[PDB]
Design a protein around this ligand. Structure first.
Ligand code: HEM
Length: 153
């Protein structure tokens, strides 16, 4: 499981991504596109965005980061029982956007990178391990959905 303890470490630091959802989402999506450029090819809107300055200036990119981070957060707060919210995500991601599960792993590490970037005294080894554990669960339940629809494998 995640224990009660670890969900607590998870939701404690999410509450301070909540205080600036938009600069967080923006850092994460740039960390992604930067570490893994083939991900940008999945977005039609964002493939004009060659440099990092252009990325940071795009308002459209920032709105997206808000969309992902508040869907993500809605899932984290559901802790454990997160099916209602994770199903629609899986459907669209598998059968529309064509987002391989591997990319969900890339974005997980960008999230943990970015929260290390901004949250030292709240993001220590025990919260990192909680967080990694909660991105895992998320990635595994999506993966189940994917198997079932006949994507990825
Ligand atoms: C924590 C991971 C992610 C979450 C929670 C997430 C959440 C969302 C949500 C809420 C939307 C709008 C509704 C929908 O289409 O489902 C969306 C759109 C989209 N996502 Fe994701 N997404 C995630 C990861 C990714 C990744 C890894 C990519 C690309 C590599 C991706 C590519 C897209 C695309 C291309 C769209 C369609 C709209 C647009 O053009 O941006 N998503 N996602």
């Amino acid at each position: 499981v995640l224990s009660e303890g670890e969900w607590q470490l998870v939701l404690h630091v999410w509450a301070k991504v909540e205080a600036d959802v938009a600069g967080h989402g923006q850092d994460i999506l740039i960390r992604l596109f930067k570490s893994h450029p083939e991900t940008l090819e999945k977005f039609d809107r964002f493939k004009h965005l060659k440099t990092e300055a252009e990325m940071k200036a795009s308002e459209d990119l920032k709105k997206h980061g808000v969309t992902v981070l508040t869907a993500l957060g809605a899932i984290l707060k559901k802790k454990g029982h997160h099916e209602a919210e994770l199903k629609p995500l899986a459907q669209s991601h598998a059968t529309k956007h064509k987002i391989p599960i591997k990319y969900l792993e890339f974005i997980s590490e960008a999230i943990i990178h970015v929260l290390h970037s901004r949250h030292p005294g709240d993001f220590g080894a025990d919260a990192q391990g909680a967080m990694n554990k909660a991105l895992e669960l998320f990635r595994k339940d999506i993966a189940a959905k994917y198997k079932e629809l006949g994507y990825q494998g």
